[PDB]
Symmetry: C2
């Protein structure tokens, strides 16, 4: 899933570099990864950010649980009675 | 956004049609789908506008173009500016 918002650039600046939420300016047409598992792209007239995280939505919710691993921007899906055991996932969404 | 499911076995879609692997096809429903040897993936082609004047303006889907326009309720031929899209 992605959002797209206007690129206002930085008023006062002599260029339309996109500013991110943490105060970094980015070159027109550049991509960066954020600190919350997103990939963002700076364009002339817009900024888009898309999640890198695929969320598992189809699996045995009785016997299995999903656990988010921030550092790898992903989920694992594992047995409740023993999270060292992996379950099968029939549907992911991103 | 997209869903990803196992290809249990070319590949077959919900509507029975078979597709050559590594192929893309567009559905009846403004989705683009791909069959990989291992999995099936479908994503929407539609950007949904969500940031706009909702008292004065409305969004109207155009299915054939898989796109929205956002226009004035009092005159749907006049466009309103949008500050955010989501896909």
């Amino acid at each position: 899933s992605c959002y797209f918002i206007p690129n206002e650039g930085v008023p006062g600046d002599s260029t339309r570099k996109c500013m991110d939420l943490k105060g970094n300016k980015h070159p027109i047409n550049s991509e960066w990864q954020t600190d919350n598992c997103e990939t963002c792209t700076c364009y002339e007239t817009e900024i888009s950010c898309c999640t890198l995280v695929s969320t598992p939505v189809g699996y045995d919710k009785d016997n299995c649980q999903r656990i988010f691993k921030k550092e790898d921007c992903k989920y694992i899906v594992v047995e409740k009675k023993d999270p060292k055991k992996t379950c099968s996932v029939s549907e992911w969404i991103i």
